[PDB]
Design an enzyme around this catalytic site. Structure first.
Site, PDB file in Angstrom:
ATOM      1  N   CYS A  29      18.076  -6.811   9.452  1.00 57.98           N
ATOM      2  CA  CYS A  29      16.735  -7.829   9.632  1.00 57.98           C
ATOM      3  C   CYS A  29      17.137  -9.263   8.930  1.00 57.98           C
ATOM      4  O   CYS A  29      17.566  -9.294   7.873  1.00 57.98           O
ATOM      5  CB  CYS A  29      15.660  -7.257   9.390  1.00 57.98           C
ATOM      6  SG  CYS A  29      15.220  -5.583  10.461  1.00 57.98           S
ATOM      7  N   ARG A  42      11.164 -14.115  11.982  1.00 58.13           N
ATOM      8  CA  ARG A  42      12.268 -13.157  11.627  1.00 58.13           C
ATOM      9  C   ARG A  42      12.942 -12.383  12.870  1.00 58.13           C
ATOM     10  O   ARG A  42      12.057 -12.460  13.749  1.00 58.13           O
ATOM     11  CB  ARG A  42      11.756 -12.137  10.726  1.00 58.13           C
ATOM     12  CG  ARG A  42      10.491 -11.532  10.920  1.00 58.13           C
ATOM     13  CD  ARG A  42      10.793  -9.990  11.450  1.00 58.13           C
ATOM     14  NE  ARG A  42      11.600  -9.017  10.897  1.00 58.13           N
ATOM     15  CZ  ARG A  42      11.211  -8.703   9.611  1.00 58.13           C
ATOM     16  NH1 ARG A  42       9.821  -8.643   9.197  1.00 58.13           N
ATOM     17  NH2 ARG A  42      12.121  -7.898   9.022  1.00 58.13           N
TER      18      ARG A  42
HETATM   19  C1  LIG Z   1      15.589  -4.735   8.868  1.00 53.94           C
HETATM   20  C2  LIG Z   1      14.498  -4.453   7.797  1.00 53.94           C
HETATM   21  O1  LIG Z   1      14.653  -4.884   6.659  1.00 53.94           O
HETATM   22  C3  LIG Z   1      13.095  -4.310   8.326  1.00 53.94           C
HETATM   23  C4  LIG Z   1      12.910  -2.641   8.304  1.00 53.94           C
HETATM   24  C5  LIG Z   1      11.711  -2.041   8.957  1.00 53.94           C
HETATM   25  C6  LIG Z   1      11.942  -0.526   9.590  1.00 53.94           C
HETATM   26  C7  LIG Z   1      10.376  -1.889   8.440  1.00 53.94           C
HETATM   27  C8  LIG Z   1       9.673  -3.604   8.076  1.00 53.94           C
HETATM   28  C9  LIG Z   1       8.359  -3.648   8.271  1.00 53.94           C
HETATM   29  C10 LIG Z   1       7.874  -2.063   8.145  1.00 53.94           C
HETATM   30  C11 LIG Z   1       6.712  -1.656   8.516  1.00 53.94           C
HETATM   31  C12 LIG Z   1       5.387  -2.309   7.445  1.00 53.94           C
HETATM   32  C13 LIG Z   1       4.254  -1.886   7.560  1.00 53.94           C
HETATM   33  C14 LIG Z   1       3.904  -0.142   7.530  1.00 53.94           C
HETATM   34  C15 LIG Z   1       4.227  -0.069   5.876  1.00 53.94           C
HETATM   35  C16 LIG Z   1       4.268   1.487   5.821  1.00 53.94           C
HETATM   36  O2  LIG Z   1       4.462   1.713   4.490  1.00 53.94           O
HETATM   37  S1  LIG Z   1       4.113   3.153   3.843  1.00 53.94           S
HETATM   38  O3  LIG Z   1       3.113   2.720   2.554  1.00 53.94           O
HETATM   39  O4  LIG Z   1       5.342   3.823   3.365  1.00 53.94           O
HETATM   40  O5  LIG Z   1       3.444   4.099   4.849  1.00 53.94           O
HETATM   41  C17 LIG Z   1       4.957   2.273   6.901  1.00 53.94           C
HETATM   42  C18 LIG Z   1       5.020   1.779   8.137  1.00 53.94           C
HETATM   43  C19 LIG Z   1       4.843   0.579   8.517  1.00 53.94           C
HETATM   44  C20 LIG Z   1       4.469  -0.026  10.071  1.00 53.94           C
HETATM   45  C21 LIG Z   1       6.324  -0.199   8.439  1.00 53.94           C
HETATM   46  C22 LIG Z   1       7.421   0.537   9.140  1.00 53.94           C
HETATM   47  C23 LIG Z   1       8.853   0.207   8.936  1.00 53.94           C
HETATM   48  C24 LIG Z   1       9.031  -1.437   9.003  1.00 53.94           C
HETATM   49  C25 LIG Z   1       9.039  -1.771  10.673  1.00 53.94           C
END
Ligand SMILES: *CC(=O)CC[C@@H](C)[C@H]1CC[C@H]2[C@@H]3CC[C@@H]4C[C@H](OS(=O)(=O)O)CC[C@]4(C)[C@H]3CC[C@]12C
Ligand SMILES: *CC(=O)CC[C@@H](C)[C@H]1CC[C@H]2[C@@H]3CC[C@@H]4C[C@H](OS(=O)(=O)O)CC[C@]4(C)[C@H]3CC[C@]12C
Ligand SMILES: *CC(=O)CC[C@@H](C)[C@H]1CC[C@H]2[C@@H]3CC[C@@H]4C[C@H](OS(=O)(=O)O)CC[C@]4(C)[C@H]3CC[C@]12C
Ligand SMILES: *CC(=O)CC[C@@H](C)[C@H]1CC[C@H]2[C@@H]3CC[C@@H]4C[C@H](OS(=O)(=O)O)CC[C@]4(C)[C@H]3CC[C@]12C
Lengths: 319, 319, 324, 324
Positions: free
Chosen positions: C1, C15
């Protein structure tokens, strides 16, 4: 610069010294009763003997790389732009940068001994009058890296037994993973499956092996050359392979421009048997290897034993 | 393999021989009255003398790289997967591959003479019993490349005075342009204008200089090392720089895997003064340079004068 | 990403999101009166409103990247192998990872404000989902001033670095990413002068040979170097439609096509969506892997004084315009 | 510029056109009864119909890339520094460069047919425009069989090579492009096994470190290597909309963003348009630098027995869909 620890059967410790100006370096042996005088540390009138490359500054040896009789070895390399020394403090043990090689090799025996005793050490900003990091190996085949930067002193375990210059050592190990696909031979074609690639050359798996004169390129290549070097060899074959390893990152005149018509080149190459206490060396002008045996002199003496490091080309004429 | 033509003041011609098995090579001098016998060409009972590395096959020299008294030099390098010899034809002059170095150096004097006389030449498929390309230089500081492939014989002007292996020479010159941004020092930051890049290491302009053991990587690096080598030097300094140039593409044991536990390494390095007719050489096992002067023997003789090429490590003991 | 901050005239934050697992992301506007309940921080009933991409779980916006009404944006990128969260401590200002974007966007206005207030902030290990494994994240924060910072919490605590290239990807730590940039100082968009072999007429067989060593891999360092090159040389002084078009092309230069980044047995990480947010006007432009057409959502066209999330569809089918 | 032949289920022919000068290109359908007048070849009043991208000068279609109704396609790419045209000779079948796409598409049906009939063909130096400077071109030809060939006329005459990677860019000659591919045989989409330093635990800090040396430059060799990688690993066995989406992403991986390829004083070569042509159904999908949305034109929805060119708009404004 490029320093390595090579363990085919015996253990060998040395370095390339790549610079643009000499400092009057010579092969000096420091007997056990040469009285060391340290800036903020107690004197050592009785210590281990040692042999290495040093610049003699009026009866005082300023070592670049050396080993002792107990099989320990230290080598100093430039850390410009990264290292930071600190003013002396009453809490920790304060070693100046120029006496580090002398203090460590005169006091301790093993890498484990050095690693444990550095927890209360501060590399002081005491100059000789008006930035380096070190590589320490021993007979176990292991080595550590000692770097003092903005966050203080650090002692890292060295899994590759090599060291160059900038950047920080954890960053050098990280950059190594960028070449995990390199193989000394031919790779399997998982690049374009189902397509016959014309393997026109041998060793196409090294096509992206770095060959530059910068610090990162020399670190990656010498780690590769050292890891694949022959093993289980006798003395002459081992020291011969040691020099070829460091030749793989040789800096030829004209390739590394550090200033206007100023070039940095491999001034000398040292190879020290950690067990037999023999220092092998050649220089840019002399390709023939020379040898100095520390155990062939009275170590219980108290005066430095200096030999010539830089010689001229010793051509053998067959006619 | 890596062959170069180096002209600091005098002119020097040599090569690295990187292989996995020796062929009994030796320093042989072929006097002017050694009778050459060619497969499909008239014999030469009187010709120029020559000195070079060759494998003696029962009183007959099979040269790998040699020079004559007139200042001409030829070196043979492998061209596997690219070269193609052809059956003899009555139209053209037919030279077998193994007698090419001998025929050219015994007949002609200059690169211009060789270039003009190759227009009616066919490299025949006549083996000694049961694929190579050549590099030809002289005292003018110029060189040509002779390659016989699927489209016949080709004679290219060599603007870089170097040669390795595959692919075709026009493709090697094309690949050179892929490194036009390389500089021995630090480049100007036109990469991210307006951003202060942390020039953490010297010679960051060589970060993408190839360092692999494949043919293209060695060609690009040795072209770089040769182009920036010192100039206007005397004999000892010139031959010293010549060896360092070829050391920049040295093949250390373990880095170039051509087969299961089979490695290709730099077996010997030759340096031949085109004017004084002196052959300098060392090998993988002996870092000390040796010298053989062809003009110190009776050239009007008719018997080969053979010297030993592969020696053991000639360590100079200071104790 | 890959996340960037682009300032041709207006300022655009956005992004690429490259992953192999989807989390039901959608365009989520959080009005000023949606009560935020924080783990170890006081609940803020009123705050700034924000628009971004988020997953909605139990009516809670878990943002991946967003901007607020006052022109400040934060993007969350994975920091696997480097990031480290820490237990809650009484002294420090504890912010959980999943509420970092929501808290920062709702409280502060500028990068300098954010930088001044992370002095005693600790990134806690309190996790929202107990069964969804997620790697540690690091954040990129920018505003209308054209400057940006990088918020990283690693083994040695929290760090805030000034970002001179206005871009961010994944591992390694940011000072190592900036150090790696110097390895490409010889790259030029056109043709370099031949100081490589002076005296030789090198045949410049192709255009832009100065980029022959520009990285194009799917890994973190390669995309960081190329997006820094593409962002630095993008056109400037452009209007709205032209700047948005240039923005998507910058991130398209490091797009991850299906099949190029293998993260498992026939499992590939690919660019799932691309977000582009005008900091000045509060408009979110976006597309996805399946829909190349760009859509837009204006945050100011909705009631910001509301108290509930306003969601829109993010992933869409391919919107082909049939000319006949 | 980069041209590919993509065969997930149907077969798709297309290209990126990266340049700094526009020539008023448009979508041009040439029906079966548009009389083709050739320079040194007989005029064909009836032939196969074709659809592609072309400039129309004096009611003459000067194609850059197109396909015919029978599922064969040809694309023209610049070959500057390598290509060479030759004077007209009486014996050989003289085809001018600007009529090569039109002649091949209108006469033959398959790659084998085309390959069998270039045995005595000479590419003549007869130029259409006398004041527009243009570099020599080389061509990529494919069909519904999934195979393709490369037509190159250089210093040593005309050559036809079988293309095992189904892609083409610019210089150097094609056998040199294939040779350069072997320099990247160690590249893998995932993580390689550590045979680099056996016995050392290298820290795989990022995903897809096997592509760390994948080229990403704007030059000809870099885009050729990466598009070969992206084409070879693209998904297969897909339907129409999914295959077209994958096609544009393959060429997006080598897109040329404004500012990255400098060809003069503040003059930049960029991807002006991207064409995608279904060989089976005769549908032309396309977008441009300014319009990210994909448009389509069905050749079979028009009267193919007509006698005049049917043109459509190629370059369009950004078609943003406003969600609110
Ligand atoms: C390519 C990258 O660096 C991005 C990775 C991607 C899989 C991530 C980036 C944003 C994340 C979400 C952010 C919001 C929440 C946070 C939760 O965290 S927890 O506290 O461990 O529950 C997990 C769910 C979620 C929706 C994240 C999922 C992974 C991301 C999309
Ligand atoms: C290849 C490189 O990294 C270059 C290293 C080279 C410049 C260094 C290596 C060892 C040095 C000497 C070490 C001993 C003393 C230390 C003194 O430090 S000071 O007290 O802070 O001034 C300086 C003199 C000397 C002799 C060093 C000189 C430089 C080195 C040879
Ligand atoms: C680094 C490389 O490219 C390796 C080259 C090496 C294997 C070659 C170089 C010179 C060769 C010898 C040349 C003289 C003759 C030629 C004969 O050719 S044949 O008649 O076709 O059989 C073979 C024997 C010999 C001695 C060559 C051996 C191989 C080389 C040392
Ligand atoms: C990146 C590339 O390789 C593509 C280069 C680009 C500028 C070319 C490709 C197709 C060309 C057009 C083809 C049709 C005619 C041909 C005429 O040739 S002439 O005989 O010299 O007159 C020139 C005009 C035109 C429209 C070409 C223009 C250049 C191209 C778009």
């Amino acid at each position: 610069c490029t320093s390595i620890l090579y363990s085919p059967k015996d253990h060998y410790f040395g370095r390339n010294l790549d610079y643009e100006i000499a400092y009057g370096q010579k092969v000096v042996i420091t007997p056990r009763n040469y009285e060391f005088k340290f800036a903020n540390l107690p004197a050592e009138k009785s210590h281990y003997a040692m042999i290495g490359i040093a610049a003699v500054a009026n009866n005082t040896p300023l070592y670049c790389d050396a080993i002792n009789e107990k099989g320990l070895g230290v080598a100093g390399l430039s850390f410009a732009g990264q290292g930071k020394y600190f003013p002396v403090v009453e809490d920790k043990k304060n070693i100046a940068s120029f006496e580090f090689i002398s203090y460590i090799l005169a006091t301790y025996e093993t890498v484990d001994q050095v690693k444990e005793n550095l927890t209360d050490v501060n590399i002081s900003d005491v100059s000789f009058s008006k930035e380096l990091h070190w590589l320490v190996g021993d007979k176990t085949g292991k080595s550590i890296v000692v770097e003092s930067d903005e966050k203080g002193l650090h002692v890292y375990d060295n899994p590759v037994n090599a060291l160059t210059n900038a950047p920080l050592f954890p960053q050098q190990l990280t950059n190594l993973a960028n070449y995990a696909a390199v193989v000394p031979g031919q790779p399997n074609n998982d690049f374009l499956p189902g397509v016959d690639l014309k393997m026109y050359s041998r060793s196409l798996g090294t096509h992206h092996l770095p060959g530059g004169m910068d610090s990162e390129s020399r670190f990656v290549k010498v780690c590769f050359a050292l890891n694949h070097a022959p093993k289980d060899s006798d003395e002459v074959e081992s020291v011969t392979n040691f020099f070829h390893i460091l030749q793989s990152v040789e800096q030829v005149k004209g390739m590394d421009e550090v200033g206007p018509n100023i070039f940095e080149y491999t001034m000398y190459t040292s190879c020290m048997n950690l067990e037999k206490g023999i220092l092998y060396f050649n220089c840019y002008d002399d390709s023939r290897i020379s040898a100095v045996d520390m155990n062939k002199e009275d170590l219980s003496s108290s005066d430095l034993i200096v030999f010539d490091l830089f010689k001229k080309q010793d051509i053998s004429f067959i006619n």
